[model samples]
Target chain A: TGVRDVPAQQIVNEMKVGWNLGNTMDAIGGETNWGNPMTTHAMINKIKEAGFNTLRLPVTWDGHMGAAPEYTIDQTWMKRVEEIANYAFDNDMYVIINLHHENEWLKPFYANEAQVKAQLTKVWTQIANNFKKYGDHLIFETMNEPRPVGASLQWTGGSYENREVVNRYNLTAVNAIRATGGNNATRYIMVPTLAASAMSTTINDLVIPNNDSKVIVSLHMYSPYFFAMDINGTSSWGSDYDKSSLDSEFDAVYNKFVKNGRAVVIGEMGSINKNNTAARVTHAEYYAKSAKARGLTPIWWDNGYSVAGKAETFGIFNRSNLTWDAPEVMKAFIKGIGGSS
Target chain B: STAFTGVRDVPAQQIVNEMKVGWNLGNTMDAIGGETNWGNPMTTHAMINKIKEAGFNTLRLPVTWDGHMGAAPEYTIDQTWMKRVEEIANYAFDNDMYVIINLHHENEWLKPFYANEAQVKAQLTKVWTQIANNFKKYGDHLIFETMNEPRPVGASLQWTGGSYENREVVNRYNLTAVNAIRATGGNNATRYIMVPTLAASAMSTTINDLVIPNNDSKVIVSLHMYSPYFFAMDINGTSSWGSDYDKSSLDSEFDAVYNKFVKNGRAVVIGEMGSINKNNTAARVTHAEYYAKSAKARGLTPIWWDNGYSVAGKAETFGIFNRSNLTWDAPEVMKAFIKGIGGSS
Candidate 1:
């Protein structure tokens, strides 16, 4: 189906690695409305200087979006998103923005089909028109982890019906974006698999709209289940088995998409802090190495919630002082990413 | 008493002065992933034998003990590792070649400004004391180099000589290692030991700030100099190296070390130095010869840092030995190398 479309190989090649602007724009209330302070140029500059060339900005348009059918994103909130995106764009760095955390309202099932499409069409059309002025450096991820909201199988690629709705949702958003014209026609858009799962079923069922060349597969993976994403999981990650497991996940993605001339971004991946600096250091290096070797770019998820001896706090840099609490970890990432060049 | 006779019995200065050109067994033992992690075959005696015959009088054995170290409280090194390193140490030591064994590639935990200061020093104490016991019978020819470029790897001041607080941690860590080694009480009491500045940097600030209050006379300053950096270690840097400005910049760096430690009754080792192969064989040869001459002329011993990667396009591929085929990658540079260190013979 991809017979005539050009693959977005250059995007992945241009992006060495990336970091998430977490807990900020996606906060329930406002930017810095979560626990993190507002984003600043100094922060983005520091991330760039630390050797990353991409930034992933997550935004939740829940409170910002007006009434349905005529849904309008708040102008103030929209401008703030643009301004923060400018911080990285000014440095000639690549940025990704997507609807985050509003998953509560964006259900993937036949029950709310009509209602969901109306809101989805309105929201995406507005976002497309609003951001149509920017060039290729900017990328839009249509949705984050589209799935059946309360289903038991939501994260497991869901049931067949849920996955079908997700495929339909992607089409709806893509059509809205292209319908805006301007620069959106040439823009690179990313769509997620059901729950953005790296599982086998998810990959097989995930659909790319229109067999488009400008579309990329977005996968958010904090892999190996136990070591990287589980708070209750083991902190020790040194065995050869650990390395093989990491390679296994990335290998699947590579064989599936990259081998076929398709591009996929490891939209999010990072080892949670368990007071294991040394282990995390090697993990970041090996993670980036494995991801890059597979022709995939792994964007680290930094939530600014670094609490040692705790679970799921993946913070590495201190935005306040522009210092890395774990400078060695950052060093390992830089050293690892440098291998790609 | 450390007066047990029959060994080469001199302090640091005399020991370093008696040395000739040295070579590093790089990317092998220091290859943290495993012995053959970085694409070199298992280390063999044939390799050390080749080095000894190739005009190298000394061997800098950089060993990383990160995963090889057992659990905490003791942080004991695994015995199999100890044995392998011992075997490697003997390949050079039994040949009567000077050998330097140091802690390397564990920079992840050997941090300077982290909150885990006491834990790191405690681990250092455990590791070096065990290392001392491992080589307890060797003479002055065997030295314990405390660390390899210990610094905050990602900090802005990492190579800028570190902060005062950072320097203090380095001093204490160095102190902890020396004290632990001496407490082992054999040839170790009188053995010449080497300690490095922050990042083993040749910066004037680091040189001036490095502290060794005990001044045990057995302590030697260790430095890693990559001069006229553009033409030497930096990959994208220039291939031209014979310019007066280039040579002066190189000399100026060596002169800084000379004026500081060399003049103060202490000796130094340009513990790591080599010109990457950029197809600039003549320039590399001249640079190698002149750099060696500059170091030795300044009362310092220079060592060649070889990674065994003879590929010309790689960054820091300062390989001179073609280990895979048991041949020399750059015989022309080797001749100039011997010529610089006052001839191999």
Candidate 2:
């Protein structure tokens, strides 16, 4: 139900401009969320040349773990994640690893209190133990935008208890990751505030317990895609006036997050409607400036809506010709104030 | 201020340097199911803006009347389609540019239906009647072309069998269209109308049959040259059309016929000439320059029929403007060919 499964390296290379790893499918047609392993070497080389120096890895653990409470992720998944991680590290690009869309099982355990603390400890224990050998280029973002409830409850925004339950789960997960030893001891763990703002409370309200310094806050900023992304309702933001207003509204939202001292990163931000190059440019310029002014890293959330499945036109380079679209334009912006480290 | 008439008066250098070049902006007669060229304002603006910047002021617009016109016994047109055509026409006018609109493609269908005495007479009257009424409001700069490439299709037949007794039908068709526009009153009385010769052929005997009507001398005989359809198009690879397409060979073959009809008071024009072979840029450019130079040398206006605007499927050789470079590659060839023509730009 997330993104289609694409090779992990392709996602890594694309993430330089900020794209989701998308989802993948196993041979049996079952789902595999986060980064896929079968990506090739040529795609990796192309991605590096496309100017991505950072890769965000979404690791879905529940796919490998068995149903019972006493479970551990498969070694194959761990090794694949490590292999992709090294590709990014070897290229001198920053690597962000995070637990993604695994809340179907993990978020529910948080409700039992003991299971909440135990599962948090168990999940991070496995991840930290597996990656204890990696260096500082690798950072861990605790969990993806966690939205948990019964199937129907998720869409309808179930009782207030469901939201409170998810918030407590997020706090428990971040604490568990920081508690892991060795390389993870001082590694920065990205603390998502309340289902990554799945609840509307300000970042100030969701306090991380123990006041850890190795903690970064994360949230997604997509204000105008409310209808176009089919977020809700059926009104069209068709006119130029409406688009300008949407941009201003999003700018204000990004500013609110920046004013807070917490180092914030946009976890996933973009729209399904990218046909409007003018509007896309405006969004990119505005987001880039806002991020730079606040010293926050702006990562594009590309879900491969490009002309080619390889993300051609929407890709920084045209996939078919492999030529840069107005290279002068992209380079000037990136050099002046764009691109994540 | 009588200007010197004939090819000797103007040099080759003047024709190519002064003549304007452009594309067939299709919107007026409603091609492709009323697809409006003005729909994409960005594209429309971009096309004109870029063309003007690249040094072009003349644009020919080919329109189909069957979708829009209705002559007596069928004597009017669909008003809505008329309005749409007018909208596009005005875009050119507003930009302060020279525009020409003609009846096209319809002639291919119209020829067979009007291939007899009774059908020819009625069809000619019906066609011009609607044209005159529809464009009555337009001004002098708006030129009306009689028909595009009248063809009855037979080897050596040229433009035969569509009219009565000794090609009288061809004369009637041109006269009808000319009289129809003049009858509408306003500036159309003196407006220039381009009339095509039999099948747009260069054969002197066939072209000499033109009978101008009612003291109306403001007419130009239009001819189309597409000689290399074999080597260029190669529909039949064995066809001799492409193999014998040498410049000097053609000059000796047709120069006398051209000087006879066009060198005098009558204006001669090559309405369409182009090569359609893929990736053969040299061949295409040579063909264009040769025709441009020959026509200009004879004081005849030469209009290129290029099919290479966007490089669709088979017609990759037709376009001179490579979208990649956005520059006309064979400018020197064209300049060399059409050097001395006046009223070109």
Candidate 3:
């Protein structure tokens, strides 16, 4: 079995609705360091019950690293992540594990290309070997928003050299994972565009790996940025302009990847609760349906934070209570998927 | 027997030299809302001492007077604010440090100066008259800056020099301010005044449009340059600075200012400049060194603006000093700045 025998589109459809296990696993401090509780098997069960069949487990390995050469990930942290990943896997839910916030090391893609490639090869090789036995239900996203963070070109689709570096890293990760054998030989892998941004430059610059057939292009968009994402921004949403803005972005992603025969996963998208729950509900309804119509996967980013005076309370789930915090928003999301509320 | 009577006759170049290096008391007093509204502690004599001890000889006190002043007609300066400002100005003067105080964040009242000249001029005259009379006894060590980056707040010309008409209005404001101070009939008659160009920008057009008054040869031109725009100011988190070429760009900006003002016997000062700490230590150190060195070589005073804020996702965090601890946030960067100006860290 070289890779998952199913076409990329079939795999994309399997992820009907998804939720990101955000901030908790990806917290630079530790799994629960960012105010989210430790992930549990019961939580996975509840996620499945809440109508989400897929879980995107964003994990960071930088805090768990050893010295160079091997730059080995800590065994305790690795096992902890695998244990949480197993919760989703045990629930028959699709799981995606990626190197989140690895930019501290991987962002050298622009400044230090040779070094970044070597590190990517080493990190992905270890990750591939570790998860090799897992079936196609498990996917590996090579890197999260790989770009030179403090560089002037970081947000502007990156420099030509930046794109080259990202393409090389993508290929390096694919080759390392493919060579690992076992289920990884044909396992689906996701790669993000430059900064995982929706800019036409980033979309057009993404070079899919030729050797990989199960590649899913990863893109993230928080369009009408001032309204949906900016903390100190307009909180009101539901205007014809807002609807058209959302549609145009969705169409861009669809035309760039889905129409070109590439399976896509919107790695992250959500409107933070700026006390604008009504607008968030509308955004969720439109965003999910548009993504589905294009045969793409829409993963709701849930950081599990709902503190009242906060800027980005993207949390819709109350992990502690094991209930949907914004049940109406959750229902709208499910409705967008043509599922029962 | 006014304090600055003896030094009033000192050449502008001599005073600029004495102000070898400067630091801004940012956010604390310059906050438009209030002095301490923007997360900075109140100014103290000990804090001024700490700054002077840290190898800085000049302090630029950017204070907003819009909210601190009485209503028009009389346009009286609030007595409480006047006393408080005087106390801080005394702290620096008492320490033998060069002090610069300016009308900061007064743009709401002053911006109208462009559209309505007579009313604006009268208000500015009264404001400067009050300020001048209050500090008339202070020595040359304390300089009065006429205004801080004056321009229409929301206009495109806020950064660049405005149109000829707007510039003319700004020129009138400066002349009125200079005249008011001269009329106070004390050390202020020959007191050195810092006049800002449009937005206090170092652009050629701004310098060209600035109308220097025929005062007692004590007016210094002020400009604010956070050069290499993205590196020093852009807060979108994407700013990489510090290449040999980047160093040359710094030189070029200073060269323009030097040729336009400093070489012509007119003293120039960079009233505000700093890079937000993105934890890019090496780049910040290089930027500080190059900026400081360029200013020194051109006989221009460089004032490091420190708002005492350094956190991710903040709008403008040019803070270098940890006012609470009375220490430089980035000692390496501070040391580089001191070393650039041929001073010991």
Candidate 4:
């Protein structure tokens, strides 16, 4: 709790290319449900070795929803989340924890509002109270990719009504955290727009809670889908349109949030393995550099599926061997953060 | 000093797919008389919302910054004018649609004469810089067309194909605009920029004579195709339509464009395309579908030109949306454009 209370922009600048602990704690059924290994401090040290200064720990609370109306998070699971966060804390790395993969009950439609609000407030309150003792580097992201499910344009910027619904949810989460008092009052909270869409409509529609200046707007962009995240997409990144389109999506967030005195982050961004290593390396470098140029932080989403010939293998780190499966992409990422490759 | 990161943009071929059908805010912003100077109502959010609902996902906002700019040297565009232009752009941009803004009806100041070239480029740098800087916060969805068209006033063969000298000057103007916008940094560095050939002509010679500045991939070639001009434009031309020979000839016009630009990785947009109302509703719909289909087939995007006149017998009536009431006057033509450009009816 003694960490200096730095502003959002400065803290964001100090962050290197971030590493998302994906498919681990947020893997629906269990920590290893998504086929990734159990949480380990040693694995985090290896990630830090690769120059990732921010560790985004995505923990799904639905797995161990405590008994009764209180629905208090299981202390064992909460401690597990904190223990791993402490590993990153040991390196003084920026950490972000959030209610990820809770979409099963957190439906965005107002029709589900009563139960959703009760569960959401209870979950956030318990989380904030548990982590309120942490320092400034520990950020509480409200939720991961909250959107109006089953709505048209669900992922690519949902309807204006959907945005209004999301706006209220974000404010509720932020308020719940602030209600915890202590460090949570001034702590940086990351809020994603509808579906975490980088589209203009969603970005413009975000209503900041309490006019809080210590907030950061976060969005996920698996850009130019045909090239960035699609399996049926082209296996090569060999076009100017590919680069330009990605730049535009990222610029959308930077324009709406970053330059206007608010902090921004590409919370999750990566091109899955289509057996195009060189192209992926090129994508990683270009994406990181573009995000950095606009003062927006770029975080790599590694799901620990680094094996070759596998679909959606966004992994770069090898948990079993303590090494990066794709060293070239890792180096490109470091190069993007103005680091020595 | 900081290093200049290279400028970036979405590939032209891909960008064209996202831009299905576009409508021009013509005769209003582009009117030399200011926004509402040409008898059209001042553009409002409701009007743009009506366009989006009428199947338009892209807006071609033509702004003539003639009297709204400051004197030489700085060439700063007046703030009120810039604010008004942005308000309209946001109407479309914030509505989840593509928006294009350009320097229109300024051909008087932009003669394309080599003698005036230096001054033209200078003013272009300052003016486009302001535009780019102001709109830099916008993403790739907001495009900047460098100019409406570059041709000397009353020059012979003005629309046919201006002289090579004029083409050369147009080339410089394109380069200057690209450079000026990129220099403003932020999102402007990678913003999609549209450049025009001499007179924005689709003639084989004029298009072939043109050159894209720096071969920037983010740049799209802007052309106006009122092809078989007698049918699409000439008020005194034929009132009937639908002949195989007519279809073949129209295909010929787009084929040339595809070969010269789109076929070789360049993005192309038919900046203006519409038929004058000759009391030929059925024929106009056919032409609309065919015109849009031909452009999309060749990887050429088209933005319909609407001058806000929908009178059944008016000579220059290309108006699709009734600005007076914020409803589409020509819903058939609008529907045809959507179906032709690969959008659901």
Candidates' TM-scores?
Answer: 0.50, 0.41, 0.50, 0.59
What is the iRMSD of the candidate numbered 3? 15.8
lDDT of 2 by residue, A219-321 (tens): 6655444432442433343343343344333333333444444455566554443344444455455555544554455454533334321222233333234
Predictions ranked by TM-score, top down? 4, 3, 1, 2
What tens digits encode model 2's per-residue C-alpha lDDT throughout B160-193? 3223333456676777778777777765676667
Quality of candidate 1 docking, DockQ = 0.01
Task: List candidate 1 segments past 4 Å from native.
Answer: A1-341, B1-9, B343-345
Q: What is the lDDT of candidate 2?
A: 0.52
Model 1 lDDT tens row, A145-175: 8876664444455667888999988999888
Off by over 4 Å in 3: A1-341, B1-5, B112-114, B343-345
Better of 2 and 3 by lDDT: 3
Worst 10 residues of 4 chain B by lDDT: B1-10
Q: Give a tens-digit lDDT track for model 4, residues A1-341.
A: 55466678887887767999999999988888888888788998988888899999998999788755899888899989999999999987999998898888877776877778788889999999999899888989998998755643344455556678788888888999999888888889999888887654566678888779888888887776777677787878745545545655565566557768889878898877777899988888888887788788888888988756567878888887788888999999878779534
In model 4, which runs have C-alpha deviations exceeding 4 angstroms? A151-153, A339-341, B1-146, B149-331, B334-345
Q: Which ten residues in a row have the lowest lDDT in candidate 2 chain A?
A: A25-34
lDDT, candidate 1, B18-46, per-residue tens: 66779999998899787999988888888
Scoring model 4 with DockQ, what do you get? 0.01
* DockQ of each two-chain model: 0.01, 0.00, 0.01, 0.01
lDDT of each: 0.82, 0.52, 0.80, 0.81
